[PDB]
A paper describes a structure:
[name] contains two tandem RRMs and an adjacent Q-rich motif. Many proteins regulate [name] stability by interacting with the AU-rich elements (AREs) in the 3′-untranslated regions (3′-UTRs) of mRNAs.
We obtained the [name]-p37RRMs protein by RNase treatment and determined the high resolution crystal structure of [name]-RRM1. The monomeric RRM1 molecule shows a typical RRM structure that contains αβ sandwich with a βαββαβ topology. The PISA analysis, based on the calculated interface area of 374.2 Å2 for the two RRM1 molecules, indicates that the arrangement of RRM1 dimer is most likely generated by crystallographic packing. The two RRM1 molecules are easily superimposed with a root-mean-square deviation (RMSD) of 1.80 Å for 79  Cα, except for the loops β2β3 (L1) and α2β4 (L2). Taken together, these results suggest that the linker between the RRM1 and RRM2 [name]-p372RRMs proteins was cleaved by a certain protease, possibly a serine protease, and the free RRM1 fragment was specifically crystallized 1 or 2 days later.
Residue numbers in the entry:
A (entry chain B): 76 to 157
B (entry chain A): 76 to 154
Amino acid sequence: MEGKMFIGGLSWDTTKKDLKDYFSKFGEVVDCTLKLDPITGRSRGFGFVLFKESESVDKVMDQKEHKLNGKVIDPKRAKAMA
Amino acid sequence: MEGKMFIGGLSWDTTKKDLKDYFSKFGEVVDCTLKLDPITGRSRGFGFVLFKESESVDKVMDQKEHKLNGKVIDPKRAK
């Protein structure tokens, strides 16, 4: 089954391509997004990743250190969202 | 803050103590229960867990899968 993640802490200069390239380290990424302010475009500071295989989510969680564009980021399982 | 969870999908043989023992690995459990039908007293096949610290709920939700008595169970935030 596909596996979905919420990604917090994304730097303001992070692009969708940045996000896709990074999480491709863990397997095939079906899609990924930044969440944008619909009015200003200010990076809300988080994004989402949709993996082809949910085992990829396990591999992300297994790895302790995630950094992207010089900022520590925080991948979470979708089910963990409040 | 405390953290309250709904625990779905419990096996018929799961006890209150099973719940306490299993979820205690994520942090202190204040209490936990097997829910019963308020009229018939019949098992509802799910339970509740009250963690002393809400952090424990986050730890539970970081885990790939939860298995108890051979069965995959389904912890949810109580809301």
